C-alpha cells in the first residue's frame, strides 16, 4: 500500500467515537500518498497515531482540529497540493487543539517544504509553540505566495528556544532535527527549489519541495507526475500518430494519469478513459462499459446516451439530502444507481404543505430490482415494522466511489432491524462499513465481511449492536444448511452459500428427483420442476430437463416428441389419439 483516499468530515463530530480512531488507523496505516484531505480531529490525549508515520504527500488539505493529543507525527509529510482547500482558503488548518494539560505542543512538520495552493490557518492552540517562527513563504510555491496566512500566537505556556542547531531560529520544535530547511528563498539565480546556495544545488524544473540532485530523478516530490521515478509534466500518451499518415497506433509506453502518478493500468474500482485518465465518474457524453474481467471503462456514447438512474449527490439529485416520498419514484425500475442512497429520519416525515404523505414501507420495494450502487449506502432511519433490509435483497455491489464523510461505503446506525438480509451483496468496492447502535441487530458476526472487501484498508467497525452472546443464547444462529456458517439472517433463504441444493432461493437437503411432487431435476445444484406432462416414476427419475420432450414417460398423450395433455384440435391441425397414446393427424383435409 502506498496510496489511500482521505476523508471529508471537516469539523463534524464522528457518529461512533468508539470506532473513530480505528477508522483512521485502517485508512492511513502504511499510506504514503493521501489522495484527498488528511483530517485528524477529535483525538484524545492517549491516542496512538503511529500509523501516520509514512504520509509524504497530501493531495487535498491537512485539517488538524479539536484534538487533545499532544503531538501528531507527520515528520515525513513533504508536500501539500491543495487541490481542495479547507474553507476554500487553506492547505493547512490547525484549530482548537487544547482546552499535564492536553493539546498540541509542536507541529514538527520538519519535511513540509511545499504548498502548491492554499494558505495556513493556525488558531486557538493554547499549548502550541514555534509556529510564529516558520518562514511560511519558503514553503508556499512561487505561484501561491500571496496565499493567506492567519497565525494565532496566543499561548498558555512559555517555549524553550529553538535548538542552537537552527541558525535562523526557524524550527518546528525544540529538537535539533526540527529546524526548518529552506528550499526556495535560498536558491541561486531564479530557481524554484534548491538543496543549497550554489546553482549546482538547484532542482530540476519538474521537482516540487526540493531535491537530492539536479536530475529529474532526484526530486523529493513531483510538480506534476511521478513517471516511474522521473518527474514529468505529463504522462506518455496512450496513442501515438504515424508521422506520415497520422493514423493512431497504441503507444507501448503509454500511461494513465492517476493523481500525480503515471500508471500502466487504472487501479481497482477506478474507470479508465479514452483521454488516458483514471476517474470515479465518466465524462458527460460517456457511458460505463464492463469487460470480461470486471474492468470498467468510460467509453464515449456512439449516439445519444440512454437514460440512467442517478443517486443522491448526482445530477438533478446533487443537492438532495435524503430519499423521501418526493423522490422515491425516481428509482422505479433501476438496476444500477449512479450516486448514493441516504435514508435519514426526515425520510419518513412527509411534506404536509403539498399534502405529500411520508415515505411508506411499501414504497421501498421500488428498490427490489436494485443490483448496484456506485456511491454509498447510508441508513440512519428505517421503519420499525421492517425486520431487515430485504428490499435490498438483490443489491450485489456497493462500489463506494463516493463515501459518506469520505470514509464509509455502508453505514447502518440507530435502526430497529433484527438482521441485515442483503443476501446478494458480495462486494464493497472501497470504503469502510460502520454498523453501530442497532439494539436488536443480530447476524453481524455471521457475515463474512472479508470476502466483501477488496483492499486491506477496509474493515467492519461495529459497536453497541445486540451482543452476540444473546444472539447465540436465543438460538439466532445460521441455518444448518448455510455453508461455513455464513448467513445474512435467520432461516434457509439467508445463506451466502448453500451446502446442498437450492429451490428458488431456499436451501434444501435434496430435490424431488425420486420422492415428492412436483418431481424435479437438478441443474447446477438447483431444483427445477419437470414439465407437468411427465408421468412421475416410482423407483427412478422422472425427467431430464424442463421441456415436455424430456419426460421418462408421458402422463396423458404424446404428440412426438412432446408429452401433451390433449391432441391439438400454420397448416390447420386436427389430430386424434392412437391406441398407444400417440397423436396422429386427421385424414379429411
Amino acid at each position, epitope marked *: 500500500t502506498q496510496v489511500c483516499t482521505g476523508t471529508d468530515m471537516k469539523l463534524r463530530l464522528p457518529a461512533s467515537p468508539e470506532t473513530h480512531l480505528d477508522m483512521l488507523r485502517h485508512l492511513y496505516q502504511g499510506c504514503q500518498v493521501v489522495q484527498g484531505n488528511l483530517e485528524l480531529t477529535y483525538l484524545p490525549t492517549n491516542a496512538s497515531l503511529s500509523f501516520l508515520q509514512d504520509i509524504q504527500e497530501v493531495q487535498g488539505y491537512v485539517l488538524i482540529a479539536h484534538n487533545q493529543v499532544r503531538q501528531v507525527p507527520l515528520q515525513r509529510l513533504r508536500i501539500v497540493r491543495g487541490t481542495q482547500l479547507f474553507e476554500d482558503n487553506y492547505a493547512l488548518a490547525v484549530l482548537d487543539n487544547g482546552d499535564s494539560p492536553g493539546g498540541l505542543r509542536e507541529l514538527q512538520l520538519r519535511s513540509l517544504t511545499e504548498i502548491l495552493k492554499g494558505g495556513v490557518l493556525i488558531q486557538r492552540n493554547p499549548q502550541l509553540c514555534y509556529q510564529d517562527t516558520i518562514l511560511w513563504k519558503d514553503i508556499f510555491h512561487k505561484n501561491n505566495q500571496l496565499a493567506l496566512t492567519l497565525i494565532d500566537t496566543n499561548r498558555s505556556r512559555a517555549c524553550h528556544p529553538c535548538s542552537p542547531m537552527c541558525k535562523g531560529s526557524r524550527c518546528w520544535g525544540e529538537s535539533s532535527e526540527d529546524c526548518q530547511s529552506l528550499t526556495r528563498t535560498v536558491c541561486a539565480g531564479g530557481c524554484a527549489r534548491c538543496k543549497g546556495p550554489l546553482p549546482t544545488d538547484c532542482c530540476h524544473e519538474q521537482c516540487a519541495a526540493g531535491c537530492t540532485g539536479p536530475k529529474h530523478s532526484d526530486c523529493l516530490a513531483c510538480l506534476h507526475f511521478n513517471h516511474s521515478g522521473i518527474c514529468e509534466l505529463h504522462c506518455p500518451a496512450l496513442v501515438t500518430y504515424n508521422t506520415d499518415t497520422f493514423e493512431s497506433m497504441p503507444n507501448p509506453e503509454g500511461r494513465y494519469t492517476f493523481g500525480a502518478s503515471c500508471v500502466t493500468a487504472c487501479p481497482y474500482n477506478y474507470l479508465s478513459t479514452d483521454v488516458g485518465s483514471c476517474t470515479l465518474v465518466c465524462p458527460l457524453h460517456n457511458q460505463e462499459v464492463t469487460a470480461e474481467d470486471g474492468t470498467q471503462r468510460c467509453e464515449k456514447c456512439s449516439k445519444p446516451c440512454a437514460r440512467v438512474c442517478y443517486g443522491l449527490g448526482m445530477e438533478h439529485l446533487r443537492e438532495v439530502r435524503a430519499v423521501t416520498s418526493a423522490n422515491i419514484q425516481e428509482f422505479a425500475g433501476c438496476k444500477k444507481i449512479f450516486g448514493s442512497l441516504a435514508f435519514l429520519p426526515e425520510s419518513f416525515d412527509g411534506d404536509p404543505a403539498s399534502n405529500t404523505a411520508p415515505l411508506q414501507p411499501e414504497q421501498l420495494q421500488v428498490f427490489e430490482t436494485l443490483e448496484e450502487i456506485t456511491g454509498y449506502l447510508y441508513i440512519s432511519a428505517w421503519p420499525d415494522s421492517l425486520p431487515d433490509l430485504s428490499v435490498f435483497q438483490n443489491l450485489q455491489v456497493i462500489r463506494g466511489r463516493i463515501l459518506h464523510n469520505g470514509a464509509y461505503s455502508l453505514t447502518l446506525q440507530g435502526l430497529g432491524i433484527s438482521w441485515l438480509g442483503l443476501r446478494s451483496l458480495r462486494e464493497l468496492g472501497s470504503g469502510l462499513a460502520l454498523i453501530h447502535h442497532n439494539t436488536h441487530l443480530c447476524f453481524v458476526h455471521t457475515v463474512p465481511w472479508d470476502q466483501l472487501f477488496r483492499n486491506p484498508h477496509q474493515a467492519l467497525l461495529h459497536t453497541a449492536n445486540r451482543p452476540e452472546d444473546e444472539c447465540v443464547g436465543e438460538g439466532l444462529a445460521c441455518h444448518q444448511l448455510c455453508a461455513r456458517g455464513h448467513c445474512w439472517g435467520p432461516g434457509p433463504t439467508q445463506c451466502v452459500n448453500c451446502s446442498q441444493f437450492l429451490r428458488g432461493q431456499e436451501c434444501v437437503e435434496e430435490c424431488r428427483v425420486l420422492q415428492g411432487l412436483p418431481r424435479e431435476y437438478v441443474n447446477a445444484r438447483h431444483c427445477l420442476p419437470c414439465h407437468p406432462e411427465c408421468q412421475p416414476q416410482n423407483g427412478s427419475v422422472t425427467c431430464f*430437463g*424442463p*421441456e415436455a*420432450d*424430456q419426460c421418462v414417460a408421458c402422463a396423458h398423450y404424446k*404428440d*412426438p*416428441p*412432446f408429452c401433451v395433455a390433449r*391432441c*391439438p384440435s*400454420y*397448416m390447420p*391441425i386436427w*389430430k386424434f389419439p*392412437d391406441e*398407444e397414446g*400417440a*397423436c*396422429q*393427424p386427421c*385424414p379429411i383435409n
Partner: antibody
Amino acid sequence: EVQLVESGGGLVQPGGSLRLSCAASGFNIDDTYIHWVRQAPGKGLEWVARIYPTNGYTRYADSVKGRFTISADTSKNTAYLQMNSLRAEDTAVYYCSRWGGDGFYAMDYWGQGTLVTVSS
Amino acid sequence: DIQMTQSPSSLSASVGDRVTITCRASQDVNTAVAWYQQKPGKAPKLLIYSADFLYSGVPSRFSGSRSGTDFTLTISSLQPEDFATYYCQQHYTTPPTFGQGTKVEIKR
C-alpha cells in the same frame, strides 16, 4: 409469407468465434421452435441446435455442446448461433429452419444457408 | 438417441420409373417421420410429414408409407426435375436425427 434469411458466415481462423443470424419474416418465432441444421461440403444434414423463444429453452447436438450457443431476440424476430472454439470439421453450410407450428414438428421452412469456412 | 439408416445411398433410374427409397429406424419412432428433398446448393424442402401425409404443394407422384420401423419414400413416375438427394428424419425424440441421404440420378 414465411421466410428465413441467414447471415454472418464467412472465413474464420481455427479457434476463433463467429455468430450467424437468422432473420425470420412472415411469422413470430415465439409461436414455434427454431433449429440450426448444417451440411459439410458433399455430406449430409446434421441437426445442431434448437430453441423455444417463448422461454429460451435450448437443446444441442453432441458434436457442438459446450461451444455453440443458440439464442433468440423476439423483439427483432431473429435467432442466433454463436460458434466459439471452431474447428476445421465445423466447415459447412449452416441452415436455419423452423418447425411448422404447435402440432407440426417437421421443418417446413428453411433459409438458403450461409457457408462457414474454418481455415488458417 | 435414435438413428435413421437410409438405403440405398445412391440409385440410377430412368424417366417414368417407380423409385423406392428405404429408411429404417433403430427403435419405435411411431409415425414421427418426415422426408425432405434437397437439390445441390439449395435448402432442403419438405415433401412428407407424419410418415405418409403429402405436404401441400408437392407433386402427387411422391408418396410415403410405413411398415413398423421401416419407412419408404416412393416416386411413382420419376421426372428429370427429381434429381436430388432425399433425406429421412425422425422427430419422435429430441434430438431430431436425419438419415444419411439417397442420391437419385436420372438415367437417360
